[PDB]
Every structure is written in C-alpha cells, then in structure tokens.
mmCIF file of N, CA, C and O in Angstrom:
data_model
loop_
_atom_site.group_PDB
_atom_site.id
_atom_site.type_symbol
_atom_site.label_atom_id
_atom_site.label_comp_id
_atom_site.label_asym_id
_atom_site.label_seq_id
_atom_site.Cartn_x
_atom_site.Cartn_y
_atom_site.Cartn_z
ATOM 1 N N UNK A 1 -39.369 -26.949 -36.382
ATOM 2 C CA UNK A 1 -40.579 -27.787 -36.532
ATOM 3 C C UNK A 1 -41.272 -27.480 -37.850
ATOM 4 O O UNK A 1 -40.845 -26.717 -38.717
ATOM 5 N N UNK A 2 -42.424 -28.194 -37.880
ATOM 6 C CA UNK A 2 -43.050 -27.796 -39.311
ATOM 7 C C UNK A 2 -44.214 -26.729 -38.968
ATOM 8 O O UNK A 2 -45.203 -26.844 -38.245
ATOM 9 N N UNK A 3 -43.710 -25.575 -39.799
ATOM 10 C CA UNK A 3 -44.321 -24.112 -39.501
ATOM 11 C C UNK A 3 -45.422 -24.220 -40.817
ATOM 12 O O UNK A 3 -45.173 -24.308 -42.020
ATOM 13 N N UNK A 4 -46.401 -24.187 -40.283
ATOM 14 C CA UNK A 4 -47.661 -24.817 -41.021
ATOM 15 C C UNK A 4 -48.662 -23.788 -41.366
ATOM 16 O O UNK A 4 -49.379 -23.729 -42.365
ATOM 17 N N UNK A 5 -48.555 -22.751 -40.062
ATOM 18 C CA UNK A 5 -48.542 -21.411 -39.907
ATOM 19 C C UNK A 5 -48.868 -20.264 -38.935
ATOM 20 O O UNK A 5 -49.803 -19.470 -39.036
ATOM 21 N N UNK A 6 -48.099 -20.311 -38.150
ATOM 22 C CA UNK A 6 -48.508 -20.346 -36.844
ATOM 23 C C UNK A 6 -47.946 -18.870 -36.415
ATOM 24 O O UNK A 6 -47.661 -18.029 -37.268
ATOM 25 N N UNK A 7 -47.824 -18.657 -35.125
ATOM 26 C CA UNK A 7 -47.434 -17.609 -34.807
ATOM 27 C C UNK A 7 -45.587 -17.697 -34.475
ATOM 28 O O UNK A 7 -44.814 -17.138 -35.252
ATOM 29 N N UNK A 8 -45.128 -18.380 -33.377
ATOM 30 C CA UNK A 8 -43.425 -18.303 -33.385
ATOM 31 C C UNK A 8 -43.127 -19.313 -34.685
ATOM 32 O O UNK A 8 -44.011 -20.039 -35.141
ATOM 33 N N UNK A 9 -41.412 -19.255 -35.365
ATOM 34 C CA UNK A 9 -41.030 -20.239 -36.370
ATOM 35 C C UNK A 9 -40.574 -21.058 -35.660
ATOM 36 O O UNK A 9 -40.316 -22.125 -36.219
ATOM 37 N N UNK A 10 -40.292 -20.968 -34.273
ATOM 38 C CA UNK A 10 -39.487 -22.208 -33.582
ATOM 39 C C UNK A 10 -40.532 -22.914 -32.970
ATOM 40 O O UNK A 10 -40.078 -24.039 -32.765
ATOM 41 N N UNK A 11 -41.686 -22.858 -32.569
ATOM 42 C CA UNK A 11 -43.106 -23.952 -32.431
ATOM 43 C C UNK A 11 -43.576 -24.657 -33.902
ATOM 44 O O UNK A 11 -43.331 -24.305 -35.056
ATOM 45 N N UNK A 12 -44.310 -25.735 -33.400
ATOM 46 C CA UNK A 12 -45.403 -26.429 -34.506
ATOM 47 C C UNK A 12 -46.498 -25.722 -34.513
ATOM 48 O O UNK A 12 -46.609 -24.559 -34.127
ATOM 49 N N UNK A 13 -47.313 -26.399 -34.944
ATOM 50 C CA UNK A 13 -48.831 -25.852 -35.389
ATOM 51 C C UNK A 13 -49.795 -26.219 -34.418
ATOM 52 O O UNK A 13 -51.005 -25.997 -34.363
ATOM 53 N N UNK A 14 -48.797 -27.003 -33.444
ATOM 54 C CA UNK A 14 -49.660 -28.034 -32.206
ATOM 55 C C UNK A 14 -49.478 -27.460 -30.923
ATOM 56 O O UNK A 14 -50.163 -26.734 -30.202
ATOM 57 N N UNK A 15 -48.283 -28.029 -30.837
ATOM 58 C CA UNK A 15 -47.398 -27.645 -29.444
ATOM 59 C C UNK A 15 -48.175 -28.073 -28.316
ATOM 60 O O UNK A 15 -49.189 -27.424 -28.059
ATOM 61 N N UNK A 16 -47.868 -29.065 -27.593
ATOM 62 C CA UNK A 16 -48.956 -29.827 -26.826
ATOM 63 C C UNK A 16 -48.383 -30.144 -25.805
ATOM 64 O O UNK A 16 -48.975 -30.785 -24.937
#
C-alpha cells in the first residue's frame, strides 16, 4: 500500500 508513514509497511495510512 502507500506507506505514507505509518507504523506496519504492509498497511496504509488509513486502514478502515
């Protein structure tokens, strides 16, 4: 996903 900057690299910045 697009790692925007988040905590895991395999989630978004959303995850909903």
């Amino acid at each position: 996903p697009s790692i925007x900057h988040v905590h895991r690299p395999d989630w978004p910045c959303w995850y909903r």
